[PDB]
Amino acid sequence: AEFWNEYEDFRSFFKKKFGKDLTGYQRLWAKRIVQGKSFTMVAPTGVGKTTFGMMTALWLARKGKKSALVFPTVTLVKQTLERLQKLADEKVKIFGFYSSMKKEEKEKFEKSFEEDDYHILVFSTQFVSKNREKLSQKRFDFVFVDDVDAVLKASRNIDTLLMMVGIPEEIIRKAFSTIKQGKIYERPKNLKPGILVVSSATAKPRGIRPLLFRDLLNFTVGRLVSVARNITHVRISSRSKEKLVELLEIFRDGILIFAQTEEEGKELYEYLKRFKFNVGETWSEFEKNFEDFKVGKINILIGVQAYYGKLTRGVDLPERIKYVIFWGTPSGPDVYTYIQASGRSSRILNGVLVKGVSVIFEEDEEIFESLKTRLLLIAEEEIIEEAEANWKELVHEVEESRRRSER
Ligand SMILES: [Cl-]
Numbered sequence: 001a002e003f004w005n006e007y008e009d010f011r012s013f014f015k016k017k018f019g020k021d022l023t024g025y026q027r028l029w030a031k032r033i034v035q036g037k038s039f040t041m042v043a044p045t046g047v048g049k050t051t052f053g054m055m056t057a058l059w060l061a062r063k064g065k066k067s068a069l070v071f072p073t074v075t076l077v078k079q080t081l082e083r084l085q086k087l088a089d090e091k092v093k094i095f096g097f098y099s100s101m102k103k104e105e106k107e108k109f110e111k112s113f114e115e116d117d118y119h120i121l122v123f124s125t126q127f128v129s130k131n132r133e134k135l136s137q138k139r140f141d142f143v144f145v146d147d148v149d150a151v152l153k154a155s156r157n158i159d160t161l162l163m164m165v166g167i168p169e170e171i172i173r174k175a176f177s178t179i180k181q182g183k184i185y186e187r188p189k190n191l192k193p194g195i196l197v198v199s200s201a202t203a204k205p206r207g208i209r210p211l212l213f214r215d216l217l218n219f220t221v222g223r224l225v226s227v228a229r230n231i232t233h234v235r236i237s238s239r240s241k242e243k244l245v246e247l248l249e250i251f252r253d254g255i256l257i258f259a260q261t262e263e264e265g266k267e268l269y270e271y272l273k274r275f276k277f278n279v280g281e282t283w284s285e286f287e288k289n290f291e292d293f294k295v296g297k298i299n300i301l302i303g304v305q306a307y308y309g310k311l312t313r314g315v316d317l318p319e320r321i322k323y324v325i326f327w328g329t330p331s332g333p334d335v336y337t338y339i340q341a342s343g344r345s346s347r348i349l350n351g352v353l354v355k356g357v358s359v360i361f362e363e364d365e366e367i368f369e370s371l372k373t374r375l376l377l378i379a380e381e382e383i384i385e386e387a388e389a390n391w392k393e394l395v396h397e398v399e400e401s402r403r404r405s406e407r
Pocket of ligand 1: 087
């Protein structure tokens with residue numbers, strides 16, 4: 001989904017209303033908000049964290065969207081309310097609450113809170129403790145939390161925040177139950193929760209509960225984990241069709257072969273058909289050939305390495321795609337196309353990140369070395385030499401991971 005026009009709209013609104021341009025960090029944070037992403041603000045104090053959350057709430061309000069700004073102190077509630085009411089347009093409904101407030105002001109908050117007649121609410125972590133039940137019955141497009149420790153003091157707190165962004169209690173329970181088993185929970189794609197932004201991160205994150213954020217909102221408030229898939233990358237220091245035939249003989253089924261050009265692809269297709277292999281091509285009849293591969297009629301599928309490729313990116317079958325073979329490295333080397341194509345062999349099938357095997361046939365030492373360093377930098381993955389690969393053990397890991405996915 002395209003986001004650049006929404007980002008410039010946010011960027012312009014910020015400059016006009018705040019008076020100054022978004023900072024380096026705020027630009028990064030804006031690009032996330034505009035895409036509906038949740039995140040932890042990783043930056044020091046005085047670089048515009050509160051200002052950013054305040055301006056986000058205001059921008060969302062123009063579209064009729066709802067926000068909750070949560071602070072650890074009463075003075076932060078008071079100051080944010082004051083700044084908001086001076087910055088606000090005629091249309092926007094802003095209400096705040098703290099215990100030292102006048103009975104008059106408290107009653108205006110309580111009325112509109114109950115009637116759902118607000119755009120922006122500003123309250124403390126103390127208000128959250130006293131009103132968990134009423135708050136968990138509400139959906140906000142944006143929840144900004146200044147206090148991180150308050151989020152994690154009580155496990156009940158994490159749940160309240162998750163419910164405030166439109167995640168039903170039943171899904172939190174199902175997610176938690178799966179995580180506890182040692183599995184990865186796959187959130188429902190049609191759910192569209194709101195944005196949760198936490199102001200800082202815990203140096204000491206504690207328990208299984210903060211993992212609900214990873215699986216439900218695609219972010220962590222703890223340490224930032226490696227982006228490595230469960231793939232073993234193996235390099236063959238040649239283009240031997242004989243070596244290829246011997247890998248096909250043990251891999252047998254669920255194989256994708258990516259050639260550099262359509263010309264080389266056809267050559268390879270010709271040779272494999274000659275050796276009576278059950279091979280299909282993707283250049284001429286993609287839809288028919290892919291369906292045949294999917295249902296198990298075709299064992300090997302040959303295609304062309306391309307950045308927004310039908311076979312390189314589009315295809316989503318970890319149960320069926322097990323082995324990816326590159327006939328030469330994607331021209332460049334193009335690590336981005338390499339990561340996408342090899343990624344076909346490894347993704348989540350029933351809470352388990354299944355095993356993939358990516359084999360590169362590359363004779364050019366220079367081209368291979370450039371691919372190896374780029375893959376280490378971008379994907380935190382290494383490529384191992386043919387002699388280091390135990391093919392029988394790899395086939396076993398491919399098969400065993402797909403049984404554990406079935407469980
Ligand atoms: Cl201001």
